[PDB]
């Protein structure tokens, strides 16, 4: 697996807006919602859970950058998993989307998987 | 357990405003005092305790987060789970309620369970 | 144990002015110095050793609460466990007073056990 | 092995211009963009697998670094070992160089290994 | 072992003004320059090496106050043990000292041993 693969989805220009920290069956996890740069759109929103799914071990990694872009609100490419949390309340109040990887971007370019 | 869970409880538009960490029965704890953003309303108190508790696995991931929120002195949400703690001086000290979730907000609007 | 424990012993508007980090006997350890916020009396001073005495567990939580309550300047109560150090040049050059709690303080009140 | 092995690769006077987290093979990774300072010259990329490698011990150290190289936005020398990652995909969004080393470079030489 | 023995150096009212960090034979490692705040001397450079020494138990507090200190740029008080370091590509890139304390410097006391 990778945050690159082509079977994940990403996000560009997009600005980390909310962070959510709590915690769920034994696990903390946290949640952000990312919205356009431009103000189009929908708003994305993603969770990481620890030591839950195959993106456990990126956990306090994402956490941390997700802290700082949100710190920053600058535009950023989030990439996800669609479809891996389960749990219904939680997926209505967040999302099934596992976050898998954040990469900042210039006006012309973000850093990171594309394709 | 989820934070999000009916039997808990939460209180929207708090600002942290005070912050305390200490330690009991071999286990490091934080307590954080919350108060209304516009100044109503009467304080919510609530700690995390390393060892002790259901929420014991998200006690760094809150301590960071509140410490976070407390530095910002953002409008929060404050999730609590009530009648947790029991030793009774640490309660009259500061509260029974459990930390069990911090949702950031942007106006009005809260991002998390409700 | 717990850092409201009657035996401990507190020190209220303080401001935290100087900070060590060193190690001994195998164990990373902090300094603070703390004097009180409007200028009188004489300075506090306390330590935490990472695998030393009852309160090793909250070694980090100390030492992160410790340097940012050090970078805001804030008045805090400081929280102690006195004769704690034996060593005894490290007890003249700092104290042997063990780090047991830090509380935020207001103009009023300070949030922590009284 | 050392980030000052004259085998390994080095650039001065660089400022960290992106940053990128993931995780690869049940490992988290990041990745940088370093761009000269003077805007002379090309990029160079270079990342740090965190199970993977014989620098997979400094990971977290290199981590911490770079953000806060990044966030500063300050002079800086990057030491890379060329022609290490492998995955095709991986190697062509990013690069095969693992970062070795950062040095900040805020006088006349910077301060590290040339 | 302690940061105050008679046996280390320390040099007061300095500024770490530059920071690397990198990896020799497996172990993290970072060095610090620091200079005096007047500009007077020479400076002093000295790294930690994670799992060499015996002041290896130090590294990550000893890391993340140089950090501090680096960032706020305040006058300190650095704690050295001379000649640890033998490599001689890094010695002569850095230096023989080991990093074994740093103290907060007012302007006419710092807070550690001497
Ligand atoms: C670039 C182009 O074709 N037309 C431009 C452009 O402004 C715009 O299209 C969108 O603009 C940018 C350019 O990359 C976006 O990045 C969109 O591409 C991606 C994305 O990276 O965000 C690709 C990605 O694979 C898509 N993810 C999924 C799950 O489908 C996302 C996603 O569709 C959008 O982000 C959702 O909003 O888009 C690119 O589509 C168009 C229309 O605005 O008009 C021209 O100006
Ligand atoms: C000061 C007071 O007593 N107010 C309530 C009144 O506000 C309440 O309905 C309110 O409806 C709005 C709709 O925008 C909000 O939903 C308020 O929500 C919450 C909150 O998010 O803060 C919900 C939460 O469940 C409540 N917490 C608990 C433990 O009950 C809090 C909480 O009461 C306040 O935060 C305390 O200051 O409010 C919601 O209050 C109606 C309900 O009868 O009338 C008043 O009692
Ligand atoms: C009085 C009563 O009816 N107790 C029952 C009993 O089944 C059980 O009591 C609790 O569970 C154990 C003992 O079985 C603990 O001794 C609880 O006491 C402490 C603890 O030792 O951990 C005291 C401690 O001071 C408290 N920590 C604080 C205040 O910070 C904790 C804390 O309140 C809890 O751990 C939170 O989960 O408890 C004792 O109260 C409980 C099982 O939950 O159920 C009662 O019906
Ligand atoms: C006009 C004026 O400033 N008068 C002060 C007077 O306020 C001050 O009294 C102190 O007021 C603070 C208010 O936060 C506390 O109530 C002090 O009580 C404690 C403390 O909390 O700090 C209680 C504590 O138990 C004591 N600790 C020990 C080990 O005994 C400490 C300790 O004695 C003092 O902190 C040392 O100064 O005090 C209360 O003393 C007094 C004393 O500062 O000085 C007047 O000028
Ligand atoms: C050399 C000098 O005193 N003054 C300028 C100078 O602007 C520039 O030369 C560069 O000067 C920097 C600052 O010390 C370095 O010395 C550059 O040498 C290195 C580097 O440290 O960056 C050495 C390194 O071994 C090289 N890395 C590899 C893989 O080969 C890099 C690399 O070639 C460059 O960084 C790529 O741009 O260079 C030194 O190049 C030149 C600019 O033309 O002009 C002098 O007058
Ligand atoms: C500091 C400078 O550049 N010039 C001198 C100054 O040396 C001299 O007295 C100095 O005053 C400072 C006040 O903080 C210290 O007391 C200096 O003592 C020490 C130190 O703590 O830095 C003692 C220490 O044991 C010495 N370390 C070693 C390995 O020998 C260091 C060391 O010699 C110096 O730091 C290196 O610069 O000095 C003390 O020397 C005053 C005269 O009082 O005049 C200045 O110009």
Do not use: M
Not at 24 to 50: L, Q, R
Not at 70 to 95: A, C, D, E, M
Request: one cysteine or more.
């Amino acid at each position: 697996e990778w945050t690159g693969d082509k079977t994940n989805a990403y996000y560009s220009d997009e600005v980390i807006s909310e962070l959510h920290v709590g915690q769920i069956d034994t696990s903390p996890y946290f949640c952000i919602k990312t919205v356009k740069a431009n103000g189009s759109g929908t708003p994305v929103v993603a969770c990481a859970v620890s030591k839950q799914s195959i993106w456990a071990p990126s956990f306090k990694e994402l956490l941390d950058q997700a802290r700082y872009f949100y710190s920053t609100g600058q535009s950023v490419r989030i990439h996800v998993q669609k479809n891996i949390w389960t749990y219904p309340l939680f997926v209505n109040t967040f999302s099934a989307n596992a976050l898998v990887g954040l990469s900042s971007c210039s006006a012309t370019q973000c850093f990171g998987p594309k394709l």
